Amino acid sequence: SMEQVAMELRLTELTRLLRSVLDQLQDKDPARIFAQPVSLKEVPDYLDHIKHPMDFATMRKRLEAQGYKNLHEFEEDFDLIIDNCMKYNARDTVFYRAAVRLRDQGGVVLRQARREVDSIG
């Protein structure tokens, strides 16, 4: 149908906007602490701690499969990255501190993205 196509154009454009958001969030992690999944070879007990692991490469795979329906779903995945880290790692670690800084710096980007998504529909 003509509608399904219209729908698919909006998804593609959402994907386009979310790709830019993702790049902006990932620049706020210059140490690349959150770039890839926590290695289960190097942290064999990780899944006993964190039930829903997340990282930027995993989000990108979902993004490029047009797997995010709205910004809320995308934010859920970003929030997992941060919250998983803040639980697994203690307060006095480079990892916990990296997550706090990502959360704080990402807030600005996510604020404007919500306005853009509402604005452009």
Q: Give the whole-angstrom CA distance, residue 95 versus residue 63.
A: 25
Please name the amino acid found at residue 82: I
The closest of 19, 20, 2 to 68, measured between CA atoms, is 19
| Dmax (CA) of the chain | 56
Please name the amino acid found at residue 78: F
User: Following DSSP, what letter does each residue of 16-48 receive, concatenated?
Assistant: HHHHHHHHHHHHT-TT-TTSSPPPTTTSTTHHH
Q: Do residues 50 and 40 touch, judged by C-beta distance below 8 A?
A: no
User: Following DSSP, what letter does each residue of 50-105 receive, concatenated?
Assistant: -SS---HHHHHHHHHTT--SSHHHHHHHHHHHHHHHHHHS-TTSHHHHHHHHHHHH
Domains of the chain in sequence order = 1-121 (1.20.920.10)
Tokens of 28: 């706020």
Q: Give the whole-angstrom CA distance, residue 48 versus residue 35.
A: 21
Distances (CA, A) of 69 to 10, 45, 62, 75, 88: 10, 32, 10, 11, 29
Q: Do residues 7 and 118 touch, judged by C-beta distance below 8 A?
A: no
> Which residues does 24 contact at the CB level (< 8 Å), separation at least 6?
109
Buried b / exposed e across 16-28, counting CB within 10 Å, b at 16+? Answer: ebbeebbebbbeb
Resolution in A: 1.7
Q: Do residues 77 and 15 touch, judged by C-beta distance below 8 A?
A: no
